[PDB]
């Protein structure tokens, strides 16, 4: 009459897992190890706020594109996929992708004046403007570099020097104007044959303008090509030119520790913190895998092409 049975727990759970032999097996308790949830925003990366360039490219932001809109540090950079305004005056930026990568994560960053626009005594310092670079509809030009042209039918040779007296590495930018005929060359710079030599303890540069017939971009056929260098503390930079020189005015105090990347994302800031950031939004880093977006920045779960990764913890049901 008297009985004792052996058995196992079951419940109302409807959750299903998979096996290397069977599929859709119902289970008592389960665990999902695939993060598929994001917050649809850009956020701080471990305390350190990102640098979001509204609608500028890194280049335009650095040079001071007038069509564009101080931050002491960032963890990563966010551009849109195609920033509305980049190089207002058509041209080119040398070793641009390397500079972008360098600037990806900056510990300290402070803009400082190194050559005052006023100090140009024998060259016309205030007529290097273009309608391609409008400010409030008036002809302007990148705010951080000076487009020098001739004064009283003459372009004396420039010799300028700057000693890095700061305790920090200095990012210095300059440029060259590629005119579109010989007439424009003499009109602007008098001298038919020009050069720009630039030297530090490591840099040994000599640029020579390229005259060419080019399609108009932003109603300009001439071109501006820009160059950069990092100037170590106590080092000097020596500029020499007899034309086409787009002088520096402002440079940047730089402190680089780690690296990062440039994120392309359409999203906006969310006064928000994460350990792992996505172009589509910030995500939690507890789970070993995620399926949001491959181009993450941070301490991130592994990116996986799965819809569900669920691990059986309980037992079979009834």
């Amino acid at each position: 009459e008297d009985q004792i049975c052996i058995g196992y727990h079951a419940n109302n759970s409807t959750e299903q897992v998979d096996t290397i032999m069977e599929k859709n097996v119902t289970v008592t308790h389960a665990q999902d190890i695939l993060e598929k949830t994001h917050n649809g925003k850009l956020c701080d990366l471990d305390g350190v706020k990102p640098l979001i360039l509204r609608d500028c490219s890194v280049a335009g932001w650095l040079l001071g594109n007038p069509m564009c809109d101080n931050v002491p540090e960032w963890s990563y950079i966010v551009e849109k996929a195609s920033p509305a305004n980049d190089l207002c005056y058509p041209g080119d930026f040398n070793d641009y992708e390397e500079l972008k990568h360098l600037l990806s994560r900056i510990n300290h960053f402070e803009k400082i004046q190194i050559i005052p626009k006023s100090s140009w005594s024998n060259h016309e310092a205030s007529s290097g403007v273009s309608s391609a670079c409008p400010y409030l509809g008036k002809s302007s030009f990148f705010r951080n570099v000076v487009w020098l042209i001739k004064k009283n039918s003459a372009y004396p040779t420039i010799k300028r020097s700057y000693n890095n007296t700061n305790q920090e590495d200095l990012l210095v930018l300059w440029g060259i104007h590629h005119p579109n005929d010989a007439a424009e060359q003499t009109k602007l710079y008098q001298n038919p044959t020009t050069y720009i030599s630039v030297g530090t303890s490591t840099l040994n540069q000599r640029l020579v303008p390229k005259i060419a017939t080019r399609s108009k971009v932003n109603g300009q056929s001439g071109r501006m090509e820009f160059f950069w260098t990092i100037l170590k503390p106590n080092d000097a930079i020596n500029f020499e030119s007899n034309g086409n020189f787009i002088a520096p005015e402002y440079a940047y105090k730089i402190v680089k520790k780690g690296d990062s990347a440039i994120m392309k994302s359409e999203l906006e800031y969310g006064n928000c913190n994460t350990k792992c950031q996505t172009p589509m939004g910030a995500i939690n880093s507890s789970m070993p895998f995620h399926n949001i977006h491959p181009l993450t920045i941070g301490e991130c779960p592994k990116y996986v092409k799965s819809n569900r990764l669920v691990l059986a913890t309980g037992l079979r049901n009834t």
């Binding site: 190890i33 990563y76 990347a261 392309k264 993450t296 592994k302």
Partner: peptide, 14 residues
């Protein structure tokens, strides 16, 4: 879960 290494990395078109 815990054996996953997950060191800081930054991924992007450069």
């Amino acid at each position: 879960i815990d054996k996953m290494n997950t060191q800081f990395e930054a991924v992007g078109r450069e």
